[PDB]
Structure formats: structure tokens, C-alpha cells
Amino acid sequence: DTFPLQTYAAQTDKDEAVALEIQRRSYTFTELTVEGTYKLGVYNVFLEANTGAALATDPWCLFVQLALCQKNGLVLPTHTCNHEMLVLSRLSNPDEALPILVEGYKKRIIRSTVAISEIMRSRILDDAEQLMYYTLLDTVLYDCWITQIIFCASDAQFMELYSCQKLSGSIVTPLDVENSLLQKLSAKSLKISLTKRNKFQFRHREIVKSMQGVYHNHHNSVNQEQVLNVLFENSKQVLLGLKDMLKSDGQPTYLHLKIASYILCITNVKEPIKLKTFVENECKELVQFAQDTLKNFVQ
Amino acid sequence: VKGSVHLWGKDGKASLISVDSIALVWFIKLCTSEEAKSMVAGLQIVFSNNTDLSSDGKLPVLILDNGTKVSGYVNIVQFLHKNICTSEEDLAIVRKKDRLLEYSLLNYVDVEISRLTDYQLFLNTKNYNEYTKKLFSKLLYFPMWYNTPLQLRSQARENCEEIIGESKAMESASQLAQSKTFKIAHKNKIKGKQELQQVKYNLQFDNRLQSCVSNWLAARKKLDDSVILSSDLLFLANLYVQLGLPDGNRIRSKLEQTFGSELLNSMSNKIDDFVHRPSNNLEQRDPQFREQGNVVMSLYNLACKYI
Amino acid sequence: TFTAKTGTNFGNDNDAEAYLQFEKLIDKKYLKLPTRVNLEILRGTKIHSSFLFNSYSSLSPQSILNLKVFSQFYNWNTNKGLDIGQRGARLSLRYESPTLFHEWFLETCWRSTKICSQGTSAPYMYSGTMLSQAGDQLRTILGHTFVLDKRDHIMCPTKGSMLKWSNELSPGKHLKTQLELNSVKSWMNDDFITFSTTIKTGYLKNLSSQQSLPVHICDKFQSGGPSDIRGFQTFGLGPRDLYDAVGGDAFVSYGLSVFSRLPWKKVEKSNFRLHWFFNGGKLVNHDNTSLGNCIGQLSKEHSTSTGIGLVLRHPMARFELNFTLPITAHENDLIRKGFQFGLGLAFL
Amino acid sequence: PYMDQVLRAFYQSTHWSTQNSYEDITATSRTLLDFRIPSAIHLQISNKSTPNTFNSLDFSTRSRINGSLSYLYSDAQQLEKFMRNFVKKSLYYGRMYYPSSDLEAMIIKRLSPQTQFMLKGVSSFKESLNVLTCYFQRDSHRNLQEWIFSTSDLLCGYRVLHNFLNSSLSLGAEFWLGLVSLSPGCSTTLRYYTHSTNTGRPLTLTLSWNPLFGHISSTYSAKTGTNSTFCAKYDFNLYSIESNLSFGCEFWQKKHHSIFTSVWKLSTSLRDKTLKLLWEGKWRGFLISAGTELVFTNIPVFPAKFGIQFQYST
């Protein structure tokens, strides 16, 4: 082991075009050294019209983002080594699900989506009644939202929320032509990866199996309409019983951060998916609650 | 409301492979009050034993006179409680202040506790081989006897995997046939490997069974505890299957070590009160020749799924 | 005419893989161009298989259209920690004893890049430059390949030079250029001592309007490995982010080789050779302004290695069993001291 | 396996006469009883790349595409007429399995007309196992002594099969001793080949033994028909008395009108209470192999592990 007769310094030439893409996708939580900072990988980021914060477009990523701002005392980013929020692809994990947490630099740990879900429900596991409500939002309200965004919204509304691929206004460039062809080629594979996240594929095996298949026959289409109608009828009952569960006694609970993260992502959809129409018309108390819950994480 | 409920059992009563079908028979038998009868009158219980009539392949189906299918025990109960006509005993209607907690308790048994009953029904090798795989011979028809218990055992493995559990052939052929000494001890390798790995699995099952029953019982002690709800009938139908399997006395041994015998015998005398009730509330039918699941009426349904 | 068969690929890094292949020489009625169609089925990665349609059609005595429709999935960078999928089509025209041909192609491809490395292997494939490259992309590429091969054999040559010039244009995205020189020479009776020299160089430019749209990791250059500069692991040279090979925008790599034919008289007259080599090279992100600053980086601090070994050079594959030492290296290279096994077709 | 039919093709080509070997003494009781049932639909195509190189590929429903590259060179220039079932000969064989990178090798050297040497390496990379075993074996016409050394524990061994005396009462023994565990082994077998005039048939009575375990075996094996065969093994045990009674009743057929060849194979056990069935159909290059297993303890029969096995080779 005297055989490397000369060794040099490591190599310090970096691709500057990669560092511009990472800075394009990075959002900074404000308010330690290099190694105590984490990066939250999220599907995409939307700009809130009211405050101007940079929120994640998915209810699970936004709930982890609000829980990170509560635990560490951070401020939401705006659309010296602070933490970060990364817009990532689903394909940055073997699990293909994307609230993920990237902690550290040289001792870098990756917590997957299953790992954060175990961490988040361990902070409420002492209270048994709050665990029932948390399980009800993460199963019944979750499965409505996924079915309204996989099946009831258009492909452009889905890829606006669940894709890091770029979005300009209209087609003026030949670069815009093949960016419009990625959103049609790859929209179905991004939908299939989203159905594997909260064991949605095991609660809803037949509507997930009808996704992975061409031509969408009439028997599969009328069975899908029966499941999605039951999921939506059950979710109006969840959302109306949540309206008597909004009183606060200080800091927001992790249940309140999960109710707020669903309302903030339903009211960000631009299409009438019938979850947006119900929440805007009947759950006006829930919309004002999600604005009150969010404004203690901004400056 | 007018419909036809399709279940899993045979000849008078629901099968033990479906805790959602058992809880639904107990639900319809216990609708004795006038507002409880108002949501159950004319529901026509049929033990058709084919999941081809379901919107998702699960068989408490409520096919209701229009093509409206509501499937699963929790979805049917939430649907039947929504259709109360409007204006104590053997079944309570929850008030508006408790509709969210009682749906939260129904959903918690459905996603957490019923996950563990399908473990003990398909992934327990003592229960699956003795009881479960030779139960579909009496439920289904002559060719379709061996694919349904293999599917449900594969689905129970996917639902339970994250909480509970050619040169190498030419190697041992050139080793153990060249040994004839660890030829017989080659199987002593893997079954001595398997036995402490199976007590490994039974320990993390029984920790997950202990926490889910403790979590449900602490939240159930927020509503009225002296009255019967829809959450109880799905919880008790999970104990009734798990304590009633071939390996069911392992669980009743461990459940009295944690919760006692003044609670396990208060839950088993409610179960035996429910099994030994008359079927006068039960208005039943026989499956017609569109609903049976024969060799000819499962080839029409197989050709309908791809058209 | 039909010719169903199987075979072996001899891939990337020592990785033999099986394929199933069908043929059909089409009869000259749906024709008057001699056409044959292929279907090569391979093992993909963990979900999909790899399918590969090909259609070679002789337009003239010296021209072949090749329509290649593919759907292939494979693993990649160091610990097979990156899962790459590729769906697309490729139209290619190839124009004509010394091998000389030009090949212009046009390829559109949808490429998915998945980090299939587990979170247990904790900083590997999880640098910020690897999290940012996962995803889907669509890309049309235009290419040209010139090959001038005057060697007497391709897998076991005794004399002759080879020159291979590759160009790739992704319009508005990148421009890629590669050169490869290989010269063979022998000095004894029945070509007992063979001296082989290889030089590989390459340049990649980002043509993308003030350094937006970075070039993908699969389109950059990678150095190191058995079929490259030996005595380093594959993807074991060049700049790093944490431990991940970020690739390079320019490279040079060279290699000398002496073969000696095993002077034991019964194991002589064979394909086995006594192999001494000296390898080296540099991999660099080239500061995309000028070509005078680029050559100053490519001439400064190389990563060299020498070693002895034994080599079989068959027309179907080359097997190598070397004992290698690294002469000079960088401090963060994967340095592979001792024995290294090589299996493939292209060694340099 | 493929290494054992390369090996038997070299034995029939150089006339080694492995009927006197102590691994083919209970051979009819392993062909008729202990055959293998497929567990899924399994396809396989095999090929030939170079004159001395073979390619295989298989995929099933349970397992996706696999493959292998074999090398096979031999001095015995009549070998591949036997690969479908004094001059010193040799055989060199190697094979890599390459989703697995699992190696295997075999060198046979016939050093003398009554002496042979054999090497057999097997090298897995993960599921890590490097095993290199040697087989020296001195044939005679009344003996086939054999000296086996392995590298499993450090296993040294010895076999002998002393033929006496158509009627041929053989007698065999084996003596293993793994030199790092010191765990010995032994056996003693007493096959007896006969003939009779009932239907046209030999007979094979085979008294086995295992003194360190007490596991006495016994095997009857008739040939009751011009194509049908039969095997009734009665097993036993000492100090832990426990019987067993296997059966096996293979049937053949052949066809005309490039010739079809059908083989039906039953094997009933009684301790495990099973019934394996297996059909195999050969053709020019194709080979279909359908087979099921039943378990007999209303509907008392349960068909565990059905399987079909398609196969092409050239």
C-alpha cells in the first residue's frame, strides 16, 4: 500500500448547469453548520395567493413541511446554510413516493415516505382518539383526493401538482412542443407511482388494476364510478364532522396540520373536481381554518 | 331502502373468512328499533359467494335496485345510516356530535384490526392449511376451488409485509450427494432456520395485535360504552374469527395476559349472544342464474371485464 | 428464415446477459428492398423486460436503413444504484477489407432515471446532483459515426490501426464529440509479441442558452473500470459530489498493452496471452468558455495505473484476469488494488 | 442438472461403465420415486454459439429471464451423440450463470484404462460458496473403488462396489469423514439384479443400511411390461421405529406418422400421503413436461404445485 506514488487534491471542477437546476428547485426555510440541515423532497411547489409562501402541492408533502416548520421554528419559503426544500422527482427513491427527508452531507441519511409516516404518527400515538382521526384522514380523505386527482382531473392538472417537469404558458418554442409531449407520455406512469404510496393499491386493487391497461372498457368505467362515488360520499361526511374539531388551545396539533394541509391542496386545484366545489361552498369554516393554521408559519 | 346484500357464507350464516360478512349479518339481526328497521327493511340477504357482483371484488356488496353498488361493511353501514328516514337497544344510532368518532372507530378496525384477522386466516400456516384453503370447496364451484385462497393469501401478504413477516442446486448435488451425511441434515438446516423465525413472526404479530386492540379500546371509551354500535360489531367479528380458528387459543392465552379475563369473557359472551339469535330479521333469498358464480356464469363475467 | 436463438451480450462491466432473439427475412413480395426484422427480448429491471425491435433494409449495395424501436430497462452507476428506462425509436442510415463506414442516425427517446439504491447505502446515489437527475426526459438526438478500421482482426488483432469518430447533436441542448485511436503492432515470428496502443478523447458542450438545461448524467463521460482505465472501479474516476461520479464534460484516456503468447509450447498456438498494460487518463468538467482552458485541465494531473495479467481474446468476448497497481490517482478515486476481472468486447 | 449429463455422456463414450458405481446402486429407486414436479409455467430455449460453446435461457412466471454460457471441450470425439440420452481422453467443462455470476466447472481425465481423475468446482459469488471436490476412481471388473476429497468441511471419502457372480449380487459401502467437524458417515447397500419369465422383466432388490442412523431401506424394482416399469420401496428406521412405503409406476409410449415419446410417471408416498403425477413429451427438438402433485388428507384431494415446462433445444 505504498503504490499510489502521487495523490492529488480531490477534484474541484463542478458542472455549473447542474448547480443552477438545483438552485432553481431549492426553497429555503428561514429563521446549522453544514451537517445539521435537512432537505425535504417534494413533488412540486405552488405559490399561495394570500400570503405568498411556497407550499408543496401534495397534502402529505405539505403536512411534513408544516410539521418541520413547527418542530424547528422555521418560516415557510417564498415562491448561509439554512435547511432547504427540494422539488424532486418521484424516481429519487426506490419507493417512488415523495415526501422524503435528506439529512446531512457526509453522513447523509435518507428517510423515505414510510419512514416519515412512522415518525409523524409516533408523535400522536399517545393520544388514542387523535390517532383515529389521523387514520381517518389518511385513509378516507386521502383516497378521495387521490381518486379525484388521478381520475376526475385532467392530465394537465395532475402534472401541475405531481410533476417537476417544467410548465410555461403556451407553445411558442420547439422546446415547448416536446415538453408538452412528456406531459402526455409520462402522465400515466406518474399516476401509477402515486397509487403505491399509502397502500392505496391494496385498498383499491381493482381501480388500480384498471389504470394499468389500455382502452378503458365500459365495465371498468362503471365499476370505477361506483367506487369513486362511495369515496366521495364518505368524504363529505368526514369534512362536515371536521368542522366541529377546529378549536385551538395554543400551537396547532398534528391533526390540525393535517386538516389544513388537505384544504390548502384542494383549494389549489384549478378544476372543479367536486372536492374543490364542496369545500369552497359548504366547508367555508375549514377554508378559514387552513388560512389561520398557515399564518403562524409565515413572517 | 330496497336492495340485495351479497355475502360469503353458506346455508344460514356468514363464513369465517369474511369478518365483514359476519358483522353485517349481526348488523341486520340487531336492527330491532323502528328507526333501525327503517334502514334495513327489504334488504334481501343472498349468500352468492361470487365477487364478480362487486365493484371492487369484496363481498359484502349492496347492489341496490339501480346498479348502485356499495361494497364493504364500513361503506354499507355509512350508506345505510345516511338513508335513515328520520323522526336504548340492541343497536344504537349515533347522534350528530359522534358521527365522526364512530366512523373513525369503524375505519380503524377496518384498516388496522382487520389486517390482523386476515393474517391469522391466510398467513398462519396452522390456520390456513387445516381450515382456510379447504373452506372454499364448499363455497365456490368445481373448477374454481384453488385460485381464490391463493389470491387472498397473496393479498394478505402484501397488506401485512411491513409490520409482520442454478449452481447452488448443482452445489449441494455435488456436496450433499457427495456427502450423504448432511443430505438428511440439509432439511435440518432450513426447518431449524424456520422455527425460530416463526416465533420471531408471532412476536411481532402479537405486539401489533396488542397495540391495535389497546388503541381501539381507549377511543371506544369516549362514546357510550353500555350500548352497541356498528364499530363493536366489526371489532367483535374480528375476535370471533381469531379466537375461533384452529390456532385460536394462542390468542386467547395472550389477550388475557394483557387485558384480563374479565374483559375477554365479557367480549365472548357478547359474541355468543350474537351467533345464537334467530333469523327472523333476516329476509333471505337464493342466488338467481345471474348471481351464482357457476362455470358458465363466470365466463360471461370474465368476458364482460374485457369488453 | 425464422431463426429463433439465444446468446450472450457481454455488456458494460463484466456483465454477461442472455437475450432471446427472433428473425424474419421478409420474402421479396412485400419488398424489392431486402429487409430483415429482429425482436430481441432481454431481462430488464425488476418490473419490465427489455424489448428491442430492429429492421435492417438494404437500399443500395452500400446503404442500410435501420429502424430500431426499443423499450429497454437496465441498471447503471457503481453499485447498480441507478435504474434507467428508455422508450423510443431510432432511424439510422449506414453508408458502406478495411472497414470504412459513415452512419448518420436520428433518435427520439423518452428516458426515465430512477434511484434504485436503498436508503441503507446512505450517501451513495443520494448526492444533490443525483437527486436532481432522477426523473423523466424527452430528447431528440442527431448523430454521426465515422469508423476507419484497418486492423486484420477486431477482437484479436495483430496489426493495423483503427479510427472511430463519434458526433452527437441534441439541438439546443448539447453537442458531443468523441475520438478513438487504436494502433496494433507485432514483432516476432508468429506474432508472438504484440504491442497495442489506444487513445480515447472526447468533448461535450452545453448548447443551452446561459447554462440552463444541464446535460444528463447518462450523456456525460465516465472513466475507470475493466473495459477502461484498469485498476479503478467502474465510474471510479473524475469529479465527485459526495461519492457519486458526476461525470465529465471532457476526457482523455490512453493505454499501452503488450501481449506475449505464453511461451509454454503446448499452451502456445492459443488465444491466451501474457498481458502487461499501462493505463491512464483524466476526466474533467471543462469550464465551458474556451478550448485553451480545457486542454490545460486535461494535461495536469492524470490517474494512471499499470499491471500484469492473463487475457483470452476470442471473437465473441475478451476475458481478462489482471493484477493491477495504481501509479498516480486522486484522493477520492475508487482505486481497486490487486486482482481485477474483465469481460467484454471493448478494452482501452 | 447439466453437469451430470455431460458426465454420463463422457462415461458412455469412453466406456467407463458407471453401473458399478456407488451412486447408481439405487438409481432405479431415484428415477421412479424421487422425480421433480414443476411448480409454475416455465419456458426454456437452448442453443449453440461456437463449436465449443452453448447458450441457455429460461424464464418462468415465478422468475424472470435467466441464462447460462457453457464451455465444453473433450478429446472423446463421439460425445454429443450421447448428449441427448489405449488413448487417454479428457473432458473440460465450464459454465457461468449470468444474472447470478455463478460459476461451475468440471475436468475429467482418464489417466489409465482402469483409472480416472475428476475435478468439480462450484463458485457462487453471493450466497457465498466455493466448493472444489476431487474424484479419484480405480475401476476393475469386480470393483469400482473411488477416493473422494472435497472442500465442503474438509470432506474425505471412499466408495467401493464389489460385484459378485443373468444374476448379479453386488455389494457396496461408503465412508465419509469431514475433517473439520469430525462427523463421520457410512452406508452399505446390497443390490441384486435378476431376470424372470413373467412378462419380460429383470428385477432389482436393494437392501440399504446406515449404521450411524439406523435408517434401513429396502427397494423392489420390477419391469412389469415391455415399456411399463415398477418400484416399491419399503423404508424403515431403527431405535425410532417408523415405516414408509413408496411406489412408482412409470409408463412409456412411442409414436410415428420425428417421433413422439410420451412418459407417464406416478409416485405414491404413504407417510406424506402424496401422489405425484408427471407427463413428459419429446419431439424433434421440443420437450413439454406437465406435472401435478396431490395430497390425500369432503373433497379429500388437494392439488398442490401444478406445473408445466416447455423446452426447446438445438
From Swiss-Prot, chain A:
Disulfide bond sites: none
Domain of life: Eukaryota
Predominant subcellular localization, coarse grouping: mitochondrion
Keyword Nucleus part of the UniProt annotation: no
Record-level GO cellular component terms: mitochondrial outer membrane; mitochondrion; SAM complex
Pfam families in alphabetical order: SAM35
Keyword Transport applies: yes
GO biological process: mitochondrial outer membrane translocase complex assembly; protein import into mitochondrial matrix; protein insertion into mitochondrial outer membrane
Subcellular location as annotated: Mitochondrion outer membrane
Keywords carried by this UniProt record: Membrane, Mitochondrion, Mitochondrion outer membrane, Protein transport, Transport
Assembly and binders: Component of the mitochondrial outer membrane sorting assembly machinery (SAM or TOB) complex, which at least consists of SAM35, SAM37 and SAM50.
Function recorded in the entry: Essential component of the mitochondrial outer membrane sorting assembly machinery (SAM or TOB) complex, which is required for the sorting of proteins with complicated topology, such as beta-barrel proteins, to the mitochondrial outer membrane after import by the TOM complex.
Miscellaneous comment as given in the Swiss-Prot or TrEMBL entry: Present with 1470 molecules/cell in log phase SD medium.
UniProt-recorded name of the protein: Sorting assembly machinery 35 kDa subunit
Organism: Saccharomyces cerevisiae (strain ATCC 204508 / S288c)
Gene it is expressed from: SAM35
From Swiss-Prot, chain B:
Main location: mitochondrion
Localization per record: Mitochondrion outer membrane
Keywords associated with the record: Membrane, Mitochondrion, Mitochondrion outer membrane, Protein transport, Transmembrane, Transmembrane helix, Transport
Origin: domain of life: Eukaryota
Annotated signal peptide: none
Pfam family, one: Tom37_C
Record's GO cellular component terms: cytoplasm; mitochondrial outer membrane; mitochondrion; SAM complex
GO biological process, one term: protein import into mitochondrial matrix
Transmembrane segments: 16-32, 227-245
Membrane topology term: Multi-pass membrane protein
InterPro entries from the UniProt entry: Mito_Protein_Transport_Metaxin, Sam37/metaxin_N, Tom37_C
Its biological purpose: Component of the mitochondrial outer membrane sorting assembly machinery (SAM or TOB) complex, which is required for the sorting of proteins with complicated topology, such as beta-barrel proteins, to the mitochondrial outer membrane after import by the TOM complex.
Subunit structure: Component of the mitochondrial outer membrane sorting assembly machinery (SAM or TOB) complex, which at least consists of SAM35, SAM37 and SAM50. SAM37 interacts with TOM70.
Xref: PANTHER family: FAILED AXON CONNECTIONS-RELATED, METAXIN RELATED
Anything else known: Present with 1580 molecules/cell in log phase SD medium.
Protein name in the entry: Sorting assembly machinery 37 kDa subunit
Classification lineage: Eukaryota, Fungi, Dikarya, Ascomycota, Saccharomycotina
Encoding gene (name): SAM37
